[PDB]
Design a protein around this nucleic acid. Structure first.
Lengths: 339, 339
RNA sequence: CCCCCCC
RNA sequence: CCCCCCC
RNA sequence: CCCCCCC
């Protein structure tokens, strides 16, 4: 059945159309040196409103890939959003859907903070501490990638995890910019990813275009590391299933587990059939996701969760254990094997 | 999963574009006999500012490979830096991005030192002690290659190691040039490698074009020796893992180590799949680096670090030991086997 | 319906 | 996130 | 870094 369902979904002669009357903003590569400034003036000043930081990160992505490539990416993502270009005025940027009041506020706040830290201090600002640093857009996109790995999770868990992991992953940027509010920027990125779902596709295309590069700075290598940490998002049950098989859990040989193993292997075969893009299904909110669910094998899922709980892997996972006896037996065996 | 991640990163139909509006300097081979002088006038005089010594070494590399080949190397490294040629004026060099005041200062300091060591002394300066010696650019690039092997490490460790190793590796040059400041030149090279990441690719291309040569002086053989000592930079955990396997550590047969051995072998298979260029991934800061991390196998990493600590190989390695009990058991077994 | 830990 | 010793 | 004896 599962192969037939995927065959129906894949073999479609008709293309969906959505967001027909909508538009979005991009910034041409000719403005990259400008957007960098903006992407850094968000980082070293303490701003009251961090509402459009995610849009500025996506603007930098658009400068990197190019306006035409970004339009093509949005078009092939199933969304008929018409790209609107970015202009300059007196210079500053007039990004579509980003209020000019916001850009002026961010620029003025950063200029005032820079003046205050230059007047009082000894005037020895290093090359990495200024807003026009060239890795500041990647530093903002690193907060974006941290909150990207938690798009399958909830908002509160995502924000808490982003802040916790960014105090260590982004320690160097925090030292360079003492006053960068990872919570508010992470909230902005979560809002962008939820509202504009095609920007998940744009962000993934940037991740690919960055990982495929021949050279990169440490910021881009960090961004790619986090982006790849997001790969199996929304499918931790499959990873824990292969973990359970590697652990040689005895309760995998139970009668009901052996009964469901056929369709479990069917799900894994479907994973292989989709191939490399299967991992990005839940990140993209591809409607085709959910063909990879193991919820139709309650006993296998309970055994997998029990094995994970025994090994300590389960952590604070919020999934359901359908069959509690199998869960407890598997947990006991996994603890015994671990000890 | 790891093979699929590498397949996504490798199979990209789009090329990244960075440093679009930026430019860099090269020196044509027709100026090599001139740049040599400069590359040696840094070595036998005591200069207040050693800021652009790395750029002068890279200029000599550009003379060696050629301006067009250097432009091609920069282009295939993922960076759209426009090469700017080097000119002469009254002769001395006007290198782009290198202030003429700096070049004049270095030349004047070297001329004054030469006059002082010729007026006071007996006037028996040998052929190797003069700035126009033809191995002086390679002597500077040897300090550059020493600090190249420490690009995965920190700045302070890199500088300390460079000075310590250069007092012995470069003893002959130090005898020839008593006043050459390995600390400041090493700092200059570290700054160049951090700022201009495409120059890592240029420096690697020089290493290849030198190792492939049919003949070479002792300076070039030393440079190639150090360059090859840099090969596995950023991946000492894989080298220590194969060391642990060679040591036949008993704790490799533990339950959790045997659990993680499958994906460990997956990482090693990915290493083989990338092939010869895998070692230069962390040296180049290739964003694709981090696919080779063994951080997702905490128990294997702890056992490997314990084995290294038992054999005395660990030295002062700053990596984390996730599971302390495995680390201590492996260290005890490794010491027992060593004794 | 699906998702949900850690890195 | 990754990296981190010695030669 | 490498090399280092004798014939």
């Amino acid at each position: 059945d599962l192969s037939y369902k995927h065959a129906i979904l894949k073999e479609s002669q008709y293309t969906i159309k959505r967001d027909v009357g909508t538009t979005t903003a991009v910034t041409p590569s000719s403005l990259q040196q400008e957007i960098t400034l903006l992407c850094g003036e968000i980082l070293y000043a303490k701003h009251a409103d961090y509402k459009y930081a995610a849009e500025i990160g996506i603007q930098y992505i658009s400068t990197a890939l190019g306006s035409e490539r970004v339009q093509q990416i949005l078009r092939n993502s199933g969304s008929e959003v018409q790209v609107v270009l970015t202009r300059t005025y007196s210079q500053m940027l007039d990004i579509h859907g980003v209020e000019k009041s916001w850009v002026e506020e961010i620029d003025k706040e950063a200029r005032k903070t820079m003046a205050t830290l230059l007047k009082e201090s000894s005037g020895n600002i290093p090359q990495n501490q200024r807003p026009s640093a060239p890795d500041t857009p990647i530093i903002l996109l690193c907060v974006g990638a941290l909150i990207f790995t938690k798009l399958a999770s909830t908002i509160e868990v995502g924000l808490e995890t982003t802040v916790r992991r960014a105090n260590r992953v982004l320690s160097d940027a925090l030292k360079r910019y003492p006053r960068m509010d990872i919570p508010k920027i992470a909230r902005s990125f979560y809002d962008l990813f939820e509202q504009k779902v095609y920007h998940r596709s744009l962000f993934i295309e940037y991740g690919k275009a960055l990982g495929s590069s021949s050279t990169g700075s440490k910021a881009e290598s960090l961004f790619v590391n986090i982006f790849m940490q997001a790969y199996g998002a929304g499918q931790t049950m499959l990873r824990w299933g292969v973990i359970a098989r590697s652990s040689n859990n005895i309760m995998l040989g139970h009668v009901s587990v052996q009964a469901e193993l056929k369709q479990v292997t069917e799900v894994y075969d479907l994973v292989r059939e989709m191939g490399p893009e299967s991992g990005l299904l839940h990140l993209r909110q591809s409607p085709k996701a959910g063909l990879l669910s193991l919820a139709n094998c309650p006993n296998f899922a309970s055994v997998v969760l029990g094995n994970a709980s025994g090994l300590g892997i389960i952590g604070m996972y919020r999934g359901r254990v359908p069959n509690t006896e199998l869960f407890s037996a598997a947990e006991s065996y996994a603890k015994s094997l671990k000890e």
